[PDB]
Design a protein around this ligand. Sequence first.
Ligand SMILES: CCCN1C(=O)COc2nc(-c3ccc([C@]4(N)C[C@](C)(O)C4)cc3)c(-c3ccccc3)cc21
Length: 384
Amino acid sequence: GAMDEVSVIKEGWLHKRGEYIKTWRPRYFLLKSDGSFIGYKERPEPPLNNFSVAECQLMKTERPRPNTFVIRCLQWTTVIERTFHVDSPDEREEWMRAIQMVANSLKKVTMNDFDYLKLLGKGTFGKVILVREKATGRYYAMKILRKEVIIAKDEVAHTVTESRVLQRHPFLTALKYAFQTHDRLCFVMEYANGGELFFHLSRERVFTEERARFYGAEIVSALEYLHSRDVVYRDIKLENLMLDKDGHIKITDFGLCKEGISDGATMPEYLAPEVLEDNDYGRAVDWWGLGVVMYEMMCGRLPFYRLFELILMEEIRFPRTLSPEAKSLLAGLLKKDPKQRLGGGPSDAKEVMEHRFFLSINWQDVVQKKLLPPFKPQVTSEVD
Ligand SMILES: CCCN1C(=O)COc2nc(-c3ccc([C@]4(N)C[C@](C)(O)C4)cc3)c(-c3ccccc3)cc21
């Protein structure tokens, strides 16, 4: 009940694998009556982990570590795994039963309607395939998860209704539909047909500030919307940015991979300093991400063209040809301390929107998709 005090169901030490730096560390966990699963560095006598076990899927495994268990949940259209280890099979069973008990207490379109044309991405949890709806001839990206990912029928129905309720957010790939077969969960989403921004930057080598400002503005707008609904994108990078047919930005939702890395040696991804430090991270990682993308757009290369050390300790250098305002924007977005970073304060995207670099931007025209694009992608077929 909501009026009742939140109470501890089960508590104790667990070994947990890091989210981004995939290394084992001992943590003290409290499973709460409201579904919070809260992790501290030491036993309380400021939590480092806090997520919900509501709607989760629990699995036993013996490899790599014996007495390992995985809490898997679906976050929007993306599988999130959290991996834990205890010292015996009996201890694991007690944890799994506790977690499951708490999760229990809180409780036509087919695949033959599509032509399957081309692979768009793959990863450990499934694949994204370019599809054509047969009856309409309209193209979509179908993100198909592997059979191992079991999700409840009420949870998929919730995501479909919640996608429909939110229909102004023009620069995100909209979820069109989601459905289950006998075995698999499929998400039908919009496909941007203007190509990869990674490709366009490679083709052109570098963008002008004007063009970079245009794409930056659209990203800033998209991030303002997500952050206003308490959503961190986490993966702002060139590979996750596409253009639609008109040349406007689409941020993608094609994640199928496990997050993170074994250690700092095996990274090239520019994770936020606070992520690398293994600290409290939040919405400020997206402003870092924007910093790195805009640096790439305007300079034609990543900041450190040893990367763990360089991100933590070394200052990002600017070409002399960058304007003072561009230099200032990038310096602000690439501050190592997320409290000092442009966008890291209470006003969030407003700080970025008010920066000298963006003074020519009409932000009403941005969100209404009314700023005219400086580049129109060449008109391709959908398969090409
Ligand atoms: C508020 C608008 C609707 N909406 C919700 O209601 C609930 O949460 C949402 N989450 C995401 C979203 C999607 C992937 C990510 C990731 N990179 C981080 C990750 C590992 O989880 C994949 C992070 C967040 C999105 C989204 C969809 C398309 C493009 C960008 C973001 C939309 C919503």
